[PDB]
Write a protein that binds this ligand. Structure first.
Ligand SMILES: Nc1ncnc2c1ncn2[C@@H]1O[C@H](COP(=O)(O)O)[C@@H](O)[C@H]1O
Length: 202
């Protein structure tokens, strides 16, 4: 169960309340490794429980810390919103802020949210780069970087954006996770250059 995987009591209560009675296979396989700080390469698709697989240990990692601690990249506004909603449910009542940054709104609204130093930022690669270029997303405290559906981000033209983000965020103290159903050459290059010999989970 989630307790036996190493998850704290308050987070487990929140998971139970959202209907997570038992971990999924990918959560059982990933979570103990994610908690150990190891880089993870997940070959998984929606339906597996992959949001919980990265999100649950991320909550355990950032709770009680200050400033932007983690960045999750998603291919679409819709997936970003869904991931952010789940993370807010996981972390219910523990003082964790989650901020979403994607296109379609003026960037001023997001800048204001980022000034408060949310522990978790979830965004699309293009919008994230806008904040990096404006210095409104500080990378100095970012200790976890998650690429959700890396193949889909590449299908939408974001490979250079992903490369840039992975190069710009300091790597030595960073834990990186990459989830993707397919791994074409461009994605394999990201793993080889920007990750630390990740554990492969299938
Ligand atoms: N351990 C679990 N028990 C029941 N439902 C879950 C569990 N983990 C994830 N889910 C749900 O599984 C669906 C697929 O999640 P994902 O693969 O993260 O897109 C989502 O609706 C989640 O809420």
């Amino acid at each position: 169960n989630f307790k036996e995987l190493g998850i704290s009591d308050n987070t487990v209560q929140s998971l139970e309340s959202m209907g997570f009675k038992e971990p999924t296979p990918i959560q059982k396989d990933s979570i103990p490794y994610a908690l150990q700080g190891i880089d993870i390469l997940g070959q998984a698709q929606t339906g597996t429980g992959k949001t919980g697989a990265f999100g649950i240990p991320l909550i355990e990692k950032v709770v009680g810390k200050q400033g932007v601690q983690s960045l999750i990249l998603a291919p679409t506004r819709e997936l970003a919103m869904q991931v952010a909603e789940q993370l807010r449910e996981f972390s219910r009542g523990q003082g964790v802020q989650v901020v979403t940054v994607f296109g379609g709104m003026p960037i001023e609204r997001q800048i204001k949210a980022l000034k408060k130093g949310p522990q978790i930022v979830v965004g699309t690669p293009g919008r994230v780069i806008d904040h990096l270029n404006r210095r409104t997303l500080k990378t100095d405290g970012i200790h976890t970087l998650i690429l959700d559906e890396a193949d889909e981000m590449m299908n939408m033209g974001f490979i250079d954006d992903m490369r840039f983000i992975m190069d710009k965020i300091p790597a030595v103290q960073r834990q990186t996770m990459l989830f993707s159903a397919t791994m074409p050459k461009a994605i394999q290059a990201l793993v080889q250059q920007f990750m630390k010999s990740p554990k492969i989970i299938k």
